[model samples]
Target: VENEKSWEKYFAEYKVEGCFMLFNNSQGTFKVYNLERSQQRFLPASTFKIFNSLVGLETGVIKDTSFVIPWDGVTRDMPEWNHDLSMQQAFRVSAVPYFQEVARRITKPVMQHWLDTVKFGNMKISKIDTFWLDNSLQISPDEELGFVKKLYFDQLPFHKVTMQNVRQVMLMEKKPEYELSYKTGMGFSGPKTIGWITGWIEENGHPSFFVLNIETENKSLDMRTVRMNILRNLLTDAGYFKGMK
Candidate 1:
């Protein structure tokens, strides 16, 4: 009943419409689920931040995550808010202005090149379609697996300079027993739906990546946290944490 218990727990507490779960290790690779209803091609929203970050780093639009940039832009309706901060700080706080500057510095052509080369949303399976369009980048779980794998292996077709930058961004940050590295993005589509992508490369040997996204009509910060907590709990419950340690 362990598997049944886990399934019941997931369904009882979460508002997930569609879900995909996969696991990979030295022994073998398996996918618990491939495609889910309605989730086949939902808008990526700010999950595109991963691509934005990659393009920014690869194109030299932004140096390191620590590169500082001055914030001087009006948002929604607030024109008086302005400040200066580094990319690292900006990412930690999910600062909109910092990424805006990154978009401004990197031209469309450069961004397109990076996305195409990395196959940002491209899927390996034949049934799914993958692409970034009108700010609505679409990717399936099958494709996401490949995308993250390329990132982990540094097999992207970017220039040597660009690849180096990507490596730095992908590496986990040391924090005692655990090393963490992640970036979250919100506010791109309408008002409510939140997008996020987070992954970790372990310190010793084990490495894994988890990317999640949620869509809803209500705009609340806690909603995003709920989805993130699900991933964290899943990792712990599945013994990924234990294996890493």
Candidate 2:
């Protein structure tokens, strides 16, 4: 809670039109920036892939972390998706096509059932594959933290094994003092581009959940890294990663 005004001023120079951040720890503490948008819902963007990966694992669409999918031969703007990728690799880099195919394989109704079970976002999937990317599915920062907290503690309405595997693949880094796991999302909601970096930070095995979403007045791709930059800088100052900084 001490980081309030600090984050507002820190993110102000990030060049985004409006920014919202939600931070909650296992100790029942909450610190928020931009209170109005904190409860507002925006498209989950690629961050939805976190739960989709869980669905893929639970449904056997992804048998394991090593489950491999041959590339669809569609050249993508990002080279990582141009080749075949295992479930692990595809998720680490935020590969869209990889999860798009996963969504296709899961089918609509079943995917809808999965989302319903987890109670994610608006729970609306108008289009089978593009719903999360489109504006149909939206989740607020506070809701995202709650969803992430459940996943972090393995309390989601999923099979225990499914949650374990998804959590394993979600690991971004393991440090001596703390471990960090997160997924980044960037996409357009209507005509404006939005970027999201949502997940939790583990300090000495204690989880602190965070959700950050920023919208740009114009469609600018640079906000993707900007989203991540703001997260790391804020966390470092908060002393979560004691050894890193």
Candidate 3:
């Protein structure tokens, strides 16, 4: 509630429409930039990797942290995905084809079942291998925060082993005063490009989970970095970065 004005002004600079939600584990929820949009769900894009990684490890679709998906012999626009990647590597780069193959391995019924178990957004799995790439599955910023909170508490119906392993891969950065972990996602909302950066920051042992999603017309540009950079600025303003701002 204290920094609401600063958060609003920071959000005003972007040409895109987006939402931000923060959940303070001990103090309850903070002010959301766009409450309505926070409740409005969109295709999760690469952010789904967070949950996808959990599902893969939980269901045993992936054996362990060392599991790797073989290369499909296709080079995507991002050179990092051109070859094989382990579950951790795929999750880091947000490799679509690898996770899509993981989804295929999980199959529709099991995927849907787990989505229902976690009450994931929309809970719909289209027939396409990369259904989540499009609008096949959707989750709101608010809901995304809740899922993240559940993950923070290890409250999901996943085994301790699975949860710990997935948590290991989600580590974005760690430093003395604060530790940040997040995932970036991008995709289309109809013809317009949409992006997301979602995760939590631990400052002084206090956890604040956040979800920020942006919508714009230019899908050609590097929108992933756009979402990520703005999110870092927002987190900085919130004092979530120890030595920043």
Tens digit of lDDT per residue, candidate 3, span 45-134? 888888888888888889987899988998789999988889889898888888888888988888888889888999888874776776
Q: For model 1, which pairs clash?
A: 65-88
Extract clashing residue pairs from model 3: none
Deviation (Å) of 109 in candidate 3: 1.2
lDDT of 1 by residue, 1-245 (tens): 01123433542366543343544444345434224521355445344555666778766778777788886645534232256777656655556566766876776566556656666664222211122323446565445555566666777665556555554565545654456555544433455454545454353565555555555555443666766676666656655554454
User: In angstroms, how far off is 67's CA in candidate 1?
Assistant: 2.0
RMSD of 1: 5.7
Candidate models: Cα lDDT each: 0.53, 0.80, 0.81
Ranking by lDDT: 3, 2, 1
- Alpha-carbon error at 35 in model 2, in Å? 1.6
| Model 2 agreement with the true structure over 197-233: per-residue lDDT tens digits | 8777777667778887888876544786787778887
